[PDB]
């Protein structure tokens, strides 16, 4: 419960990327009014204060906000940071506009249970003309996976369970997207971007999208799953730009990777251009067409 | 969602203990009427049929029951096993009494989110005079732990978080019992039984209990936590008795161990008899007194 804010703090890629962005681009914060959407323990608000913010407003609907209040006092920042409990859609801020919005809002596969809707609400209601929102740029990518042993573990497993048939269970496990760190040696294609978001110009409408994709296969193997992940960019007006990836070739983060199991694994050859289609609909669902099968997946 | 029934099936200590109990004591099942409380995928009901049950009634409130129905048909057991959807407290069984109750009902630390209340309800309402309930005997034990590095990781961690004070968070993390597999080398006492349950004679009233305990310290060290676990016995009328432990000296199970962190670690010496008191109250709470401090813990 508090453990989960602790896990996010201990995700060094996450927390240090935000730290570095803020501390190495103080001109973005100096004498500015900052809104921290979903502030949690208030760590991002404290970075922003340290980087010279004139005022920081930290908003969170959760009980964690009472901890944040005590945390702000312990660090003698109450003259700079004001915490407000509630949803961004409901609270009264003590200003009309802010100069900068910062938020750690990202869900699994970027969009599952994300706080992006709220951040966009904040942008449209509270962001000053010429203001900025960070991180400003996000992408989502897909990558092909070959792991016949894991497929066997999840699927063929059900043909004989302590001597009994359980085949019908395959159809219940296939639709459940898995959140897990992948062994990077199991990747069998180059990644393919399926979505680019700039938070300055994106609407809630753009978060439901469709994309044709082509996976450039790099190993002759059996394709058993498709994995997804996202990359986060701090770019606008930065002298020191910051990027982090949640992909399997990079240091693991608490977002891990998202895995969509294929009911029917199929063979691919190195150098092949494997084409498919992906659509995300509003909890989200992900519909995948590949090798002439189509499956919709959810994250329960 | 279905993944979780899968995890329980893949817990070999769990599932094979029940398998072995049932298959190696067929006289308990032969021509009997069996009730499987919280049957899940129906695996225990199928064991019981294979061991010669005349009729098996499998009850579960969850959606999993529809899978169990198809699973029973795939194995051509519908002439022996009848599945019924609902709570045991609400359903209509097509008999008045059963000869044998079987259930996998156990929660973390035995009692957190357990199905025991339901199993006891079933015993009192449906069990024939002279019938039996399995597993019939359960115990709970405590053991002392020394892990100064992990304590530092959970507690001292909060004194400086990316340069900021967060000490107040210590009081939010201390009350959260942790479910996790312990390195057995960190155990610094012999275990102490704090509770013995026989399911034939236990009432719901006995599940809230108090126990004085004495931990026989085996290593001069800093005590940083108290761990708990449980053992499960199949005994009554068995020619082949079966026991499994969920303790840290045994093969890990999905119940792992439950850890109660001490806010203030204290020194102990090998050979010392460390005395305390533990009380479980109705989601459960666990109140622990040790070294003249008292803390109540929950599993959120
Ligand atoms: O706390 C433990 N694991 C849970 C954990 O690291 N998190 C981080 C995020 C929230 C939950 N695990 C032990 C395990 C044993 C311990 C023994 N002595 C003191 C402390 C101990 C802690
Ligand atoms: O399914 C995966 N992990 C989750 C899991 O084992 N459980 C068990 C209980 C319910 C959830 N993990 C992969 C990971 C990669 C995979 C690649 N190809 C096929 C299948 C793959 C499966």
TrEMBL record, chains A, B:
Q: Does the keyword Chaperone apply?
A: no
Q: Reaction(s) catalyzed by this protein?
A: L-arginyl-[protein] + S-adenosyl-L-methionine = N(omega)-methyl-L-arginyl-[protein] + S-adenosyl-L-homocysteine + H(+); L-arginyl-[protein] + 2 S-adenosyl-L-methionine = N(omega),N(omega)-dimethyl-L-arginyl-[protein] + 2 S-adenosyl-L-homocysteine + 2 H(+)
Q: Which UniProt keywords apply?
A: Acetylation, Cytoplasm, Metal-binding, Methyltransferase, Nucleus, Phosphoprotein, S-adenosyl-L-methionine, Transferase, Zinc, Zinc-finger
Q: Which GO terms describe its cellular component?
A: cytosol; nucleus
Q: Name one GO biological process term.
A: methylation
**Transmembrane regions listed in the UniProt entry:** none
**Where in or outside the cell is it found?**
Cytoplasm, Cytosol; Nucleus
Annotated Protein arginine N-methyltransferase domain ranges read 139-291
Keyword Membrane assigned? no
Q: What is its EC number?
A: 2.1.1.319
The superkingdom listed in its UniProt entry is Eukaryota
GO MF assignments: protein-arginine omega-N asymmetric methyltransferase activity; zinc ion binding
* First-tier enzyme category under EC: transferase
Please state what the protein is called: Protein arginine N-methyltransferase 3
Source organism (scientific name): Homo sapiens
User: Which gene is this protein's source?
Assistant: PRMT3
Which section of the whole protein is represented?
243 to 548 of 548
């Amino acid at each position: 419960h508090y453990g989960i804010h602790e896990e996010m703090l201990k995700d060094k890629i996450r927390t240090e990327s935000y730290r570095d962005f803020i501390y190495q681009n103080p001109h973005i914060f100096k004498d500015k009014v900052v809104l921290d959407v979903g502030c949690g323990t208030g760590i991002l608000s404290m970075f922003a204060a340290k980087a010279g913010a004139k005022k920081v407003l930290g908003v969170d609907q959760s009980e964690i906000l009472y901890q944040a209040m005590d945390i702000i006092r312990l660090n003698k920042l109450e003259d700079t940071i004001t915490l407000i409990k509630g949803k961004i859609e409901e609270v009264h801020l003590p200003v009309e506009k802010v100069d900068v919005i910062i938020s750690e809002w990202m869900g699994y596969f970027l969009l599952f249970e994300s706080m992006l809707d709220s951040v966009l609400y904040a942008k449209n209601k509270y962001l000053a003309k010429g203001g900025s929102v960070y991180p400003d740029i996000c992408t989502i990518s897909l990558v092909a996976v070959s792991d016949v042993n894991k497929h066997a573990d999840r699927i063929a497993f059900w043909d004989d369970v302590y001597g009994f048939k359980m085949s019908c269970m395959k159809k219940a496990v296939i639709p459940e997207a898995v959140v897990e760190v992948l062994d990077p040696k199991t990747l069998i294609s180059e990644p393919c971007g399926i979505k680019h978001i700039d938070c300055h110009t994106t609407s809630i409408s753009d978060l439901e999208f469709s994309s044709d994709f082509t996976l450039k296969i790099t190993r002759t193997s059996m394709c058993t799953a498709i994995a997804g992940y996202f990359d986060i960019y701090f770019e606008k007006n930065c002298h020191n730009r910051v990027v982090f990836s949640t992909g399997p070739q990079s240091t693991k983060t608490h977002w891990k990777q998202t895995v969509f199991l294929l009911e029917k694994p199929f063979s691919v050859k190195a150098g092949e251009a494997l084409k498919g289609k992906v659509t995300v609909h509003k909890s989200l669902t992900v519909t995948l067409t590949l090798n002439n099968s189509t499956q919709t997946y959810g994250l329960q």
